[PDB]
């Protein structure tokens, strides 16, 4: 249970990083 | 590559390679291309591929495609629609339906077409009780098909949606993964080549592969049908055919072979009175060999 | 017996530039010319080059004056490596949008009678802006049913304009999608067009002029800061609607301060970095 | 940013809609009609929108 929660949080963090990078790129290109 | 079609093939190969892997690298590349490329077809393919990449975690595809769906580029909006459809095929996702509902009346005809087809794909086989918007979307399809001052492509999408919602009679569902957790190559290929109907209508006859029967079939020692009757600890109304268009029992019986839905698997049970017994638990579903 | 809606007309960069330049040169008239190309398959009409022809007319019509020129030009291009033959004609509509008139339809009828799949291209110079060029390709509909067969969504992606619909689109003629396929050398040359000389990059900028510009902008920023202080005291004694119309006919100190800050930062950072780079590179 | 871009993309066809005459109201009258002087033209007995 605790292992599942910990690994799920890790996956969520990685996804949040991916989304952050994608949003920054989207903003930069929307300026153009 | 410099050819937009070659770049589109690049996006498609990313999808097929990292199909159902949740690969952060692949998602990063797809999103970069979707928000950067100069060709709208390439953007559309890039957004679409995310469904194949993330089909094993349907709860996450909305989290990445909502903003793309609410965008200034109709091609990217259509890509988001189809990405949600592929990601949540045979799942009836509340978030997916909520995202698709605003897009069903988008200004752009092909955006509406994609939204309708994606909604049908997601809500295949789902009843009123299971999903509280299936009847609404059925009426929407009928209205679009009947209106005589609507776009031809929107009508095409509505007709295809009607066809997909009630497929194989009503005894088939679209799932990119088998009941055991393996990627279904026929279904992946079928959905891809069906998505490639934007360029060639005849290719629409590839969702036939994606269609997978939803049935619990019994067998005897000699591999022949036994006349067994399975039990579903669910109300008759829920998990039932919608209707033939012109004290609730808490238990139902189904005859081999039985039209049993993927959600109904969890509840299906066998009556111990009958002489036949299920070798592997009936919750697994599929062809089951019955011991006696 | 179909003529599909996924058919496209491939216009080369050279053809597009020639068309636009001639059309803009003849701003009041409908200057016109021929398009050379190939009929590759039933889903492609490649336009590789266009050449204008001797023509004369008024602001209400334009007509060609000699066919000998057209024949001789075709021959003398074939002799140098352009065996392609006429696949259509182009003429400019200066400000009326893109569509065909009656005389245009008659000319297109003649071209269709000669070759079945000939097309007409209308380029409007003045309505064209830097990012976008207003151009469309057309072909006629017989006296019949549907003009074309749809085996894809490619045809229905353009949302035909109201002016073209009024002037006869989808009733006397139908449009064809224009695509701009390019080769590697064309892409490279288009990208290289705007590239500047290398020395221009490292060249510095007169320090007297640079200091004068900095001084001028800082002096302006002083008054802008005074006005900004005055404006900040407002925005509390302002109706939620009145704020929007408050900046109508009156300067915006915040916006001007931001612009000046950006320009100053760019100029000074660039100059300092160039100075250091030169300091190292040149001994 | 996306909303700004979308508005600037639909604004081209939004700007071709016809303007509206500006008139001076003389007096309301009748069921829901009004009397208006549309300078330089004469007066009109116009309706009123439901809003
Ligand atoms: Zn004309």
Curated annotation (Swiss-Prot), chain A:
It comes from the Eukaryota. Transmembrane segments: none annotated. It is found in: Cytoplasm; Nucleus. Component of the 26S proteasome, a multiprotein complex involved in the ATP-dependent degradation of ubiquitinated proteins. This complex plays a key role in the maintenance of protein homeostasis by removing misfolded or damaged proteins, which could impair cellular functions, and by removing proteins whose functions are no longer required. Therefore, the proteasome participates in numerous cellular processes, including cell cycle progression, apoptosis, or DNA damage repair. Component of the 19S proteasome regulatory particle complex. The 26S proteasome consists of a 20S core particle (CP) and two 19S regulatory subunits (RP). The regulatory particle is made of a lid composed of 9 subunits, a base containing 6 ATPases including PSMC4 and few additional components. Interacts with NR1I3. Interacts with PAAF1. Interacts with TRIM5. Interacts with ZFAND1. Belongs to the AAA ATPase family. This is 26S proteasome regulatory subunit 6B.
Swiss-Prot record, chain B:
It comes from the Eukaryota. The modification N6-acetyllysine is found at residue 148. PC repeats lie at residues 9-44, 45-77, 79-113, 114-154, 157-189. Belongs to the proteasome subunit S1 family. Component of the 26S proteasome, a multiprotein complex involved in the ATP-dependent degradation of ubiquitinated proteins. This complex plays a key role in the maintenance of protein homeostasis by removing misfolded or damaged proteins, which could impair cellular functions, and by removing proteins whose functions are no longer required. Therefore, the proteasome participates in numerous cellular processes, including cell cycle progression, apoptosis, or DNA damage repair. Component of the 19S proteasome regulatory particle complex. The 26S proteasome consists of a 20S core particle (CP) and two 19S regulatory subunits (RP). The regulatory particle is made of a lid composed of 9 subunits, a base containing 6 ATPases and few additional components including PSMD1. Interacts with ADRM1. Interacts with ZFAND1. This is 26S proteasome non-ATPase regulatory subunit 1. It comes from Homo sapiens (Human).
UniProtKB/Swiss-Prot annotation, chain C:
The lineage of its organism: Eukaryota, Metazoa, Chordata, Craniata, Vertebrata. A motif (JAMM motif) lies at residues 91-104. This is 26S proteasome non-ATPase regulatory subunit 14. CDD domains: MPN_RPN11_CSN5. It comes from Homo sapiens (Human). The modification Phosphoserine is found at residues 128, 197. The gene is PSMD14. GO terms for molecular function: endopeptidase activator activity; K63-linked deubiquitinase activity; metal ion binding; metal-dependent deubiquitinase activity; metallopeptidase activity; proteasome binding. GO terms for cellular component: cytosol; cytosolic proteasome complex; extracellular region; ficolin-1-rich granule lumen; nucleoplasm; nucleus; proteasome accessory complex; proteasome complex. Component of the 19S proteasome regulatory particle complex. The 26S proteasome consists of a 20S core particle (CP) and two 19S regulatory subunits (RP). The regulatory particle is made of a lid composed of 9 subunits including PSMD4, a base containing 6 ATPases and few additional components. Within the complex, PSMD4 interacts with subunit PSMD7 through their respective MPN domain. Interacts with TXNL1. Zn(2+) binds at residues 91, 93, 104.
UniProtKB/Swiss-Prot annotation, chain D:
Coiled coil: none annotated. It is found in: Cytoplasm; Nucleus. Changing residue 9 to Q: In a colorectal cancer sample; somatic mutation. Component of the 19S proteasome regulatory particle complex. The 26S proteasome consists of a 20S core particle (CP) and two 19S regulatory subunits (RP). The regulatory particle is made of a lid composed of 9 subunits, a base containing 6 ATPases including PSMC5 and few additional components. Component of a complex with USP49 and RUVBL1. Interacts with PRPF19. Interacts with TRIM5. Interacts with NDC80. Interacts with PAAF1. Interacts, in vitro, with the thyroid hormone receptor (in a thyroid hormone T3-dependent manner) and with retinoid X receptor (RXR). Interacts with ERCC6. Component of the 26S proteasome, a multiprotein complex involved in the ATP-dependent degradation of ubiquitinated proteins. This complex plays a key role in the maintenance of protein homeostasis by removing misfolded or damaged proteins, which could impair cellular functions, and by removing proteins whose functions are no longer required. Therefore, the proteasome participates in numerous cellular processes, including cell cycle progression, apoptosis, or DNA damage repair. Belongs to the AAA ATPase family. This is 26S proteasome regulatory subunit 8. It comes from Homo sapiens. The chain holds residues 52 to 102 of 406 of the full protein.
């Amino acid at each position: 249970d605790l292992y599942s929660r910990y690994k799920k949080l890790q996956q969520e963090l990685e996804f949040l990083e991916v989304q952050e990078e994608y949003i920054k790129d989207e903003q930069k290109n929307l300026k153009k | 590559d410099k050819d937009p079609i070659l770049r589109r093939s690049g996006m498609y190969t990313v999808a097929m390679a990292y199909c159902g892997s949740g690969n952060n690298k692949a998602i990063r590349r797809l999103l970069h291309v979707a928000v950067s490329d100069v060709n709208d077809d390439v953007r559309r393919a890039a957004v679409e591929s995310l469904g194949f990449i993330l089909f094993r975690t349907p709860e996450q595809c909305p989290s990445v495609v909502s903003l793309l769906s609410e965008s200034y580029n109709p091609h990217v909006r259509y890509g988001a629609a189809m990405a949600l459809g592929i990601c949540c095929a045979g799942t009836g996702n509340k978030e997916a339906i909520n995202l698709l509902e605003p897009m069903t009346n988008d200004p752009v005809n092909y955006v509406r077409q994609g939204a309708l087809i994606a909604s049908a794909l997601i809500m295949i086989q789902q009843t009123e009780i299971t999903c509280p918007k299936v009847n609404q979307f059925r009426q929407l399809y009928s209205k679009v098909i009947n209106d005589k001052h609507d776009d031809v492509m929107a009508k095409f999408g509505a007709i295809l949606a009607q066809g997909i919602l009630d497929a194989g009679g009503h005894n088939v569902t679209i799932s990119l993964q088998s009941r055991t957790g393996h990627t279904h190559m026929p279904s992946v290929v079928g959905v891809l080549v069906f998505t490639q109907f934007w360029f060639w209508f005849p290719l629409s006859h590839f969702l036939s592969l994606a269609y997978t029967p939803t049935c619990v079939i019994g067998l005897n020692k000699d591999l022949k049908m036994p006349k067994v009757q399975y039990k579903s600890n669910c109300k008759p109304s829920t998990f039932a055919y919608p209707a033939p268009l012109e004290p609730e029992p808490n238990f139902q019986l189904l005859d081999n072979p039985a039209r049993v839905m993927p959600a109904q698997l969890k509840v299906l049970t066998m009556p111990e009175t009958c002489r036949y017994q299920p070798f592997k638990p009936l919750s697994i579903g599929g062809i089951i060999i019955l011991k006696d | 017996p179909a003529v599909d809606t996924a058919e496209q007309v491939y216009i080369s960069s050279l053809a597009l530039l020639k068309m636009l330049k001639h059309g803009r040169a003849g701003v009041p008239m409908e200057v016109m010319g021929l398009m050379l190309g190939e009929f590759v398959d039933d889903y492609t009409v490649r336009v590789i080059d266009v050449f204008a022809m001797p023509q004369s007319g008024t602001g209400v019509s334009v007509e060609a004056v000699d066919p000998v020129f057209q024949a001789k030009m075709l021959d003398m291009l074939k002799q140098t490596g352009r065996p392609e033959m006429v696949v259509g004609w182009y003429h400019s509509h200066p400000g009326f949008g893109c569509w065909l008139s009656g005389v245009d339809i008659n000319t297109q009828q003649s071209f269709e009678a000669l070759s079945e799949r000939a097309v007409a291209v209308v380029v409007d110079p003045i309505q064209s802006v830097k990012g976008k060029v207003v151009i469309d390709a057309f072909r006629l509909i017989n006296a019949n049913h549907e003009p074309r067969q749809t085996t894809s969504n490619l045809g229905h992606l353009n949302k035909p304009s109201i002016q073209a619909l009024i002037h006869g689109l989808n009733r006397h003629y139908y449009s064809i999608t224009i695509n701009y396929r390019k080769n590697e050398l064309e892409q490279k040359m288009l990208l290289n067009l705007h590239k500047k000389s290398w020395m221009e990059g490292l060249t510095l900028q007169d320090y007297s002029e640079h200091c004068k510009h900095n001084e001028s902008v800082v002096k302006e920023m002083l008054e802008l800061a005074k006005n900004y202080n005055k404006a900040v005291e407002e925005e509390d004694k302002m109706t939620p609607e009145q704020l929007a119309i408050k900046n109508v006919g009156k300067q915006d100190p915040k916006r001007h301060l931001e612009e000046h800050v950006d320009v100053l930062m760019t100029s000074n950072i660039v100059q300092c970095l160039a100075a250091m780079l030169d300091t190292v590179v040149f001994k | 940013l996306n909303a700004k871009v979308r508005l600037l993309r639909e604004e081209l066809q939004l700007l071709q809609e016809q303007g509206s005459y500006v008139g001076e109201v003389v007096r309301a009258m009748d069921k829901k009609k009004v009397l208006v002087k549309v300078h330089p033209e004469g007066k009109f007995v116009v309706d009123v929108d439901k809003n």
